[PDB]
């Protein structure tokens, strides 16, 4: 009986080692591991015969549906288009922003003007919207 239990303990200890060098020492993007809320810092304390882990996590709430586009473009020059980085292009619903479209964070709803910091150039695609007038990122 002791031989069996000792072996299972060793395997369990290996798991703990893996979590300390992933889930604890750094943020992890793979999910599954850690708490079920994306991942943010976690902590570990001593416990009898083992380690006790605590995981801080992010839980989203109050989801809403919004209109969004695959990308935006200059209708006068279909040879340079853009797409958001780590966020989305959504139709504007905010009185502060005069722009037809706005950038948002992906973890939380929060509109912002579209700027080069939030975009990357991409090859053109048929599903991108054609903006024939005011698009500042790039203006040209």
């Amino acid at each position: 009986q002791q031989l069996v239990r000792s072996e299972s303990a060793a395997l369990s200890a290996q798991l703990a080692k893996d979590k300390v060098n992933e889930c604890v020492k750094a943020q992890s993007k793979r999910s599954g591991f850690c708490g079920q809320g994306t991942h943010i810092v976690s902590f570990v304390v001593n416990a009898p015969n083992g380690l006790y882990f605590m995981h801080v996590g992010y839980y989203p709430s109050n989801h809403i549906e919004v209109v969004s586009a695959y990308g935006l473009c200059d209708a006068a020059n279909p040879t340079n288009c853009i797409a958001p980085v780590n966020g989305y292009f959504i139709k504007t619903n905010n009185t502060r922003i005069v722009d037809e479209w706005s950038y948002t964070g992906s973890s939380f709803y929060a509109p912002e003007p579209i700027t080069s910091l939030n975009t990357k150039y991409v090859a053109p695609q048929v599903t991108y919207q054609n903006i024939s007038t005011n698009l500042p990122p790039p203006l040209l």
Partner: antibody
Amino acid sequence: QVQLQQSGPELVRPGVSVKISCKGSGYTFTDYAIHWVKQSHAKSLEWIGVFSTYYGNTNYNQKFKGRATMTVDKSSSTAYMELARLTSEDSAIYYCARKSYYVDYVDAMDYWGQGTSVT
Amino acid sequence: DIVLTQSPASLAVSLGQRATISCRASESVDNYGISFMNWFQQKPGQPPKLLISATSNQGSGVPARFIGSGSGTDFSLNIHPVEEDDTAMYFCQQSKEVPRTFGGGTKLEIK
């Protein structure tokens, strides 16, 4: 208690730029874009432009891009517009308005200034 | 922006009469089903007043008597209880595209 305060009317001579104001009251001024409209007749009105009061971003009717421009004094909670190069054809009743979304993704004029005029 | 027109150029009615106004667009205004249509009210000596929006026939500063209708290029405004103080010019407005133009309007009157 929202109100807009347009500046008084003037019989301005041609070739003179014309400045008009529309101070906000009863709300935080920086949270809403300002819109301007030109009324040359009760049957003839056209949009002039829009100005964000937080980012300073604008759009203009293409016909006025070489003409009127807009600014905001965030500490006076007021919006201003100035028409370059007045001509007799520019006499009009001018109206500022406050942006709103009574419907999702639909811009609406909401509150209106009492109106001002120039000739 | 899409061109807007309206008819009849003026309408006169008996008090408490139902009444409507036709409004047409040069191009359909529906985008993602949004419509973007606003109607306004104006009387001399005063600024225009927002009445309704394509999905708002109540609220937006008015009683439920102001019912917007239609889709695509055709729209209308319908009021079952017209009253003497409802006489005003009325204006369709398009929020779909810059310049954000709007119609010259029509005028309601009591006979």
